[PDB]
RNA sequence: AAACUUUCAACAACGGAUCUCUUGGUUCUGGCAUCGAUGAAGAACGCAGCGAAAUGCGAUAAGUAAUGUGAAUUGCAGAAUUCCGUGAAUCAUCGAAUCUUUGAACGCACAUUGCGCCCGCCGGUAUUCCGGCGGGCAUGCCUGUUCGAGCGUCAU
RNA sequence: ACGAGAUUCCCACUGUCCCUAUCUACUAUCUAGCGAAACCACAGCCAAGGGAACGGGCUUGGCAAAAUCAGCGGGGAAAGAAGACCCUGUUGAGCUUGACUCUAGUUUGACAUUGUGAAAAGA
RNA sequence: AUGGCCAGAAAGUGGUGUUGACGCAAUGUGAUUUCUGCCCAGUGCUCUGAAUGUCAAAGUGAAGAAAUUCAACCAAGCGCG
RNA sequence: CCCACCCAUACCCCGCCCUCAGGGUAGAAACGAUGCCCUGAGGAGUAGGCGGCCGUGGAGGUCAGUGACGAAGCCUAGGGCGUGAGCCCGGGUCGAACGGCCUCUAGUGCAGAUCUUGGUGGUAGUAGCAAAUACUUCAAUGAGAACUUGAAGGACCGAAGUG
RNA sequence: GACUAAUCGAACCAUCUAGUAGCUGGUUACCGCCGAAGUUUCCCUCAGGAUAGCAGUGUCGACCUUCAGUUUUAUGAGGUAAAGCGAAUGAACUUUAAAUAUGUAAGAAGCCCUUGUUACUUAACUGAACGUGGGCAUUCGAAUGUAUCGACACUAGUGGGCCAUUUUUGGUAAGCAGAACUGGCGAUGCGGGAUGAACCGAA
RNA sequence: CGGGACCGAGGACCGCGCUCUGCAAGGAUGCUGGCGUAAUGGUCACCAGCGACCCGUCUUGAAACACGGACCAAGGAGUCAAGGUUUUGCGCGAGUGUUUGGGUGUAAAACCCGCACGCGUAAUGAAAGUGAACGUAGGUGAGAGCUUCGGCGCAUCAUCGACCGAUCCUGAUGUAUUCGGAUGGAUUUGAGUAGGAGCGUUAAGCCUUGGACCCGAAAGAUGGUGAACUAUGCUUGGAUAGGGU
RNA sequence: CCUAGUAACGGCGAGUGAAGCGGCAACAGCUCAAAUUUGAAAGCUGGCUUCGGCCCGCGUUGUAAUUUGGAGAGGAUGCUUUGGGCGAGGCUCCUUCUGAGUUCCCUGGAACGGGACGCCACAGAGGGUGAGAGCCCCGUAUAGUUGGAAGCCAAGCCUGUGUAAAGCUCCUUCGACGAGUCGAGUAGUUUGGGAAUGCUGCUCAAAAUGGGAGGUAAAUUUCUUCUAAAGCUAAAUACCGGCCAGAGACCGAUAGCGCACAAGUAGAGUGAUCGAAAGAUGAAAAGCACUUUGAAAAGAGGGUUAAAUAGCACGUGAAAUUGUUGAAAGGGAAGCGCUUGUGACCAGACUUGCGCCCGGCGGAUCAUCCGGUGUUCUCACCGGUGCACUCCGCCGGGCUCAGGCCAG
């Protein structure tokens, strides 16, 4: 608004490489880290198993239907197996979710 | 980084008519369906899979059905854009899957259709009778046969007797490995035909 | 003391600010597609009982016909209207018409109301003269018709 | 020879001067009528002091009496003087030259337009 | 004169030109009289006189699997004389 | 060398204004708590920075707002309030609208720009109305006659003319 | 360099165009609270730059720690005056010791001791540094003052100006020209110097 | 113990006290007179004593010079847009943003809808690529607040460690015997991790680009109009006493 | 919309800058050349028609049918498909028509203002009418309702049926597909494509699983996508021109377009061009009869009007500046600040209130109790009861206190 500034106040007194035709959809790789994986269960369910009510059954997670490519390593676990379904992994989560004791899939 | 170094106020562009533009688009597509009823006011489309490896997850609404696809649900490519089906003679079917979906699409489409005859009075065998035209009908093709799983399920449960076992020495190795096959496939090759020049040389 | 100069006040002057008004601009939105050789846009000259302009119109000239409404127009003058009606009006609508000289402008020209040509009709004693009236006479190109030219190719 | 070209001198001649005076007409002047403009912060007597070499206004003095008319050219005003001159420019423009980059014109070569035959020399 | 001097964006374009060396075009000086200090050869003027010395494009040859690279040849002008 | 005396916005005491700082204020008889009560210190200002308020055109809400028994505007040696920008009233004129409060909004506040447009002074009844030889008498007309007319005179152009 | 419609070292008309200027002029109510500055350091200079320093609004952190253009104490620079040489020796003599301002230091955040290592150093486990543990709160170890804290964020002007006292360096026939500190002015009214940028008193 | 001047802030009581029936003790009362209106007070004009340069701009350090101002009314100059940045207010929060579009409507309003997408949630490297827990998300010294009074210790700061990517060195088990890169070190590096903080919006300051606070050049360019003046030329016309040699 | 100020381009850097995917709006597909109809040019312009057709011709150097790459041509095979004519009804466009006070009172020149009593409302949008009107008038809302024209959509209903055309399924075979064009070199220009862009000119100049493309030059071997050098086609999109219409937190006659007016006019310039100023009496002209003075313009009486303090100089009527009247000052400037005085002119303040003691009046809304009601649940109101030593006003006195200004 203009009645509140200062000019009606001071009224009176004045490298490396080129890449041609780069295209993003080759390098779309979405990642998301281990402490967030359980977030992707729906919440009734994910409350059900970190309850411990489901043990005979095993959740699986496909990180390409929530839009993620690669699963990386940051956080921890509980102990609880989980099949995690994804195009990309890292060594350490690959290591924290065998140590968890689920498997991951490798998938396109 | 500002583009204001042309003469820029000769085309500014404003959007004042956008809420005139709404109701003149409402008008236009509510003559189109007074004009088209009893039909829908549009088209039906096939399920397609976006391309590249960014939206290959998810699938959508295409042009229009192959010609394999209407051979295989027996529809003739000129009756079907007589009957509310677009066809596409570009696209064509690489693998089984799409097609089976569209041609299970297309005798969805078919079992649903209702066909009145061209002389009310000389009803053929492929129209459709009287007393079967009257029924509750849809004029929203895009709503009644629309992408129902654009996406595959994120969330499935197994039990734990069903665990894969998993690819032999990891998920990373084996990528790496992959990784190292594709980089090394002509190295390979040129160290083999060597070898076997060189073994049919001093055999 | 007056006059004079200046100041203050009232009233009167000068001038057109302020206030109020707005058949006007400005901006946005919605709808529509319609100029011209069947002569446009523009220009000029004229037309009302009494107008110079603006507006309207074209020698049928502030206009004609047709449809509708239904009693005016108005500054003056002069006439209304059988009012129980083919009917006032500077009325509306508008399908029929008129539409001067020009202008892409078209017989040749135009700084000329200049000079022609072709075919009819009428009038004046008129086979010959004179006058008037009407219809025509640009360029490029297309299809077709008809009349032609060339040892260009042939038949005979 | 010719010259509204620049210069020195001689004779004649005279108000150029000694040295000014006088006359005429039209103005200026006064009246009737008619009637501007330039310019204008405010105004207008001086002297001494007012550091920045400047006072009209301040300080200290001289002084100082309405309203006016004809003249005058000291001062203030007054010069299309916001001129001219000097200085500065990321200055503009005209002009010159083996300044830079280009270019009209001109000149030279090649390709095409460009065909039919000979005679020699090569490959 | 298949020329010179010009003009035009170009033209089956125009001028000089209804012209032809006692002519046309461009310079310098500027009536008449007087009048050409002495001698050259550095800049310049012009000589198709021999050279390939510089030497563009096109063309020719060699190598390579090719892109390409390397060689001679090389007009006018410059250079030399 | 000595005594008294004069006075600055300086110093002392008192009142008031503002700013800053430190306290108090609910089993609320309790307050524009954004208030009120107590105490102390300080007060110049260019460039510059910040805060609060006044005013103008228009918008929403509100004041069951004002008004032809007179809105707005204007004049006023007539008053009241505010440190101030301003606000309110009385009197005169006038004729159709307008205002207060809280939010919203801006083409919102002038002495200058050799500013723009319009209007008006002093100068000033002043400069001036002085080239082309020149006018005069009677009568008529008319409200009014140097510059209208008729007659009577006097002159000028002077035939490359004032024809 | 004349003329080409009062226009000519390149006419007039419209448009691009509200062209550009670092140069000139102007830039609109009030009150309140604060409030400045001129080589500090670096860069090739003038037709140059940043930058230190000085300011205002906000905040935040325990606004915790205290610090200070001051004096004193110890110790430097200035041993320079001075007293004596019946002290020695002879400003350069000294038992002793100036005025003027000036550097450094003056605590628990400190002081040592011990332990070892050293890649420092030393003849050297020797000093010192690095750590380790312990002892020291009996007075926290001068005066005076202390609404004076610190860190961010954002914003602004000025950043090789004038005058003067003192110190110091050079000079001129005489004038004077450089630096360092401080004060005043540019921004400032009041009383007195008759008057007034630089004087006195006082804000 | 006298003589005089100026002032009277506050508004039940509370307190310190004293000379204690009361008081000069945390701020003036008592008595009396005239008048009750222009008498006091105020405004305007004028005289008198004292005081007092004409404003704005420019310049430098400042004056002076210089520039603008005859007078009055109305008009008249830091605006808008886009993009950043810091701060304030608001909503939601590891999410956030309905308004490109669709539905709906009392119709440019309001209300409703969701797919994609932007920003953020992960960085590093030229790239291929790889990608963040030894530990109650670590130790030490502070640190508001709390405490069962032993300590626990937010934000934040200092310091020592740990992890991820990049650089250099070594090269384990294995093996498409030529691939793979574990393990261990050494440097800087990155607003990297180490118990998310962002997204949208409002308001203010500042910065960048646009005519960019307003007025002002000599200029440059594009397309047109003039030889009625004047210059030269062509065609067709016209004109110029009397003397001397 | 996003991709994205990204890939990329750029002296000495100022700067520049797309596209694929993804979401949405809107969707619609096709026609030739290259084939022999060859058992029949089956095609077409024009002229004359008696409206049956007949002629002059075009054309075989190719007009019809068939085919267009998604295919098709030829076979096989057995089923499907079709042409006309009515048409209820609906929509679009001009037309007839629509509710309610001019009721009473006051002010006013005039009610459309104020007060009272009503009414209409799917209409309280707007305008006019002598001042702010839902009901005075035009219109406004909604269903409809008259009359007319031309189109489109359309539920259904009558009839011919297969001479011919058309679709589907399968297949040995065949399967023509655009040339100075593509491409290459060079030059200019352009682009983010100054290593990967497009266009144009000159030179060279193709091919048959061939050709183009696959954003770093080349060779070899593969792969993936289309099928150039012929052509048509609605929609979603743009819109300072034209016509019609509706609006606005816009401007209110120096503003807003240059123009609200006989404005692109008057006027200027040879010309190209340049280009203004200028709105408002009053509700109604009722725009001043008549007399008088002047040659006249006009003036004065007298009129109109609600008002001439509205007189075609016309609503309101500021300032600069001017005249008259009244007051004042003035010995070479005025103007301004502090403080008295003089003269002129003014705003306030005050006028008496409160509380007692008597006397005289005028009334029982005194205290208590009862019943009802409401509340804050113990406080009140209402109805009865007071019978005048109690309450409430009034009128005369007397007393105390507080009251204005200047002072001792």
Same mark, same amino acid.
């Given at each position: ?108 | ?61 295409? +042009?229009?059905?192959?010609? $394999? &696809?209407?051979? @295989? /649900?027996?529809?003739? *490519? !000129? ?11 570009? +696209?064509?079917?690489?693998? $089984? &899957?799409?097609? @089976? /979906?569209?041609?299970? *699409? !297309? ?97």
């Amino acid at each position: 608004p203009t009645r509140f500034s200062k000019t009606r106040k001071h009224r009176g007194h004045v490298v490396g490489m080129r890449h041609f035709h780069l295209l993003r959809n080759h390098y779309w790789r979405p990642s998301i880290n281990i402490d967030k994986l359980w977030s992707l269960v729906p919440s009734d369910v994910r409350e059900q198993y970190l309850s411990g009510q489901k043990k005979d059954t095993a959740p699986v997670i496909d990180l390409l239907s929530h839009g993620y490519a690669k699963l990386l390593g940051k956080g921890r676990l509980p102990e609880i197996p989980v099949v995690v379904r994804a195009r990309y992994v890292s060594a350490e989560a690959e290591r924290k979710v065998k140590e968890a004791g689920g498997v991951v899939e490798l998938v396109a | 980084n500002n583009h204001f170094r042309k003469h820029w106020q000769r085309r500014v562009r404003c959007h004042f008519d956008q809420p005139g533009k709404k109701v003149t688009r409402r008008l236009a597509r509510r003559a189109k369906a007074a004009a088209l009823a009893p039909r829908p006011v549009d088209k039906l489309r096939p399920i397609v899979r976006c391309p590249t490896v960014k939206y290959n997850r998810r699938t959508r609404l295409g +042009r229009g059905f192959t010609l $394999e &696809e209407l051979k @295989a /649900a027996g529809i003739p *490519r !000129l009756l079907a854009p007589t009957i509310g089906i677009a066809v596409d003679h570009r +696209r064509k079917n690489l693998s $089984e &899957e799409s097609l @089976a /979906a569209n041609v299970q *699409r !297309l005798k969805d489409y078919k079992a649903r259709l209702i066909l009145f005859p061209r002389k009310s009075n000389k009803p053929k065998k492929a129209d459709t009778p009287k007393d079967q035209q009257t029924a509750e009908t849809t004029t929203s093709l895009r709503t009644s046969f629309g992408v129902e799983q654009p996406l595959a399920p994120g969330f499935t449960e197994i039990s734990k007797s069903e665990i894969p076992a998993g690819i032999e020495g990891g998920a990373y190795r084996a990528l790496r490995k992959a990784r190292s096959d594709a980089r090394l496939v002509g190295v390979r090759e040129k160290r083999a035909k060597e070898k076997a020049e060189a073994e049919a040389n001093k055999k």
